[PDB]
Ligand binder design. Structure first.
Ligand code: SF4
Ligand SMILES: [Co+2]
Length: 242
């Protein structure tokens, strides 16, 4: 076997991909999440998945107003959490309630209480970051995309979350081959990207914005995309709408 970065080296213009995305879409980086406990960050990330930004934010507001401490959510059970989520709008309330409840119940029974503060105590070394990743991945229902998001957003650890928008753009740019699944795409990005948190955070913020707002699934805005000169797919889309 062979590292993904050797099977698939980044292009000569990779640095310009990073800098043009940052300059165009995130010239001033937003703050990462600094919640009292990473458990709150994890739950906030769960609310964001398969959801609009507006609904996820309303749900966070309503959920935390309803349950000022997570102990109250655990007592109210998945039915209570579901009702709370449903009241703020948005679907998948039953799925999300079960998922959140399962995390809380696991933490209470086996981790001494409703907290993920222990994630902050692992060393800030590649070995410690891997422990933090493994601990998030050991929570019931928590998949790799959410693990990467919590590491990057809540823990200041240099994971490399790649959302579906970013992946679509990466495949159109031919940064990664079409057949690679989302987890393999994340692994490739984590191998090739500069190791530092800030660069990785900047790519995630700017890449999500680019993929959502420019490299749209139907009708991408190639003429207005700063990556057009590097992109093998632009001509197909441009000539197509003509
Ligand atoms: S040129 Fe078009 S297809 Fe290529 S990255 Fe930009 S928006 Fe996406
Ligand atoms: Co048009």
């Amino acid at each position: 076997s062979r590292p993904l970065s050797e099977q698939n080296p980044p292009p000569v213009w990779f640095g310009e991909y990073l800098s043009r995305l940052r300059d165009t879409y995130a010239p001033e980086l937003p703050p990462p999440r600094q919640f009292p406990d990473p458990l709150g960050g994890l739950i906030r990330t769960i609310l964001s998945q398969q959801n609009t930004r507006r609904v996820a934010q309303r749900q966070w507001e309503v959920l935390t107003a309803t349950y000022p401490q997570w102990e109250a959510a655990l007592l109210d059970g998945p039915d209570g959490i579901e009702a709370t989520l449903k009241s703020a709008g948005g679907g998948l309330s039953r799925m999300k309630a079960d998922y959140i409840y399962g995390i809380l119940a696991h933490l209470q029974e086996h981790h001494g209480g409703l907290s993920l503060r222990f994630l902050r105590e692992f060393p800030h070394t590649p070995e410690g970051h891997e422990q933090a990743r493994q601990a998030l991945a050991a929570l019931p229902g928590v998949g790799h995309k959410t693990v990467a998001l919590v590491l990057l957003f809540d823990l200041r650890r240099p994971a490399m979350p790649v959302d579906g928008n970013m992946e679509r753009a990466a495949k159109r740019l031919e940064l990664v081959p079409a057949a690679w699944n989302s987890h393999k795409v994340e692994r490739w990005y984590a191998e090739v990207m500069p190791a530092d948190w800030e660069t990785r955070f900047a790519l995630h913020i700017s890449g999500v914005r680019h993929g959502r707002d420019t490299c749209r699934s139907k009708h991408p805005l190639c003429p207005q995309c700063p990556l057009r000169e590097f992109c093998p797919s632009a001509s197909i889309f441009e000539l197509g709408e003509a």
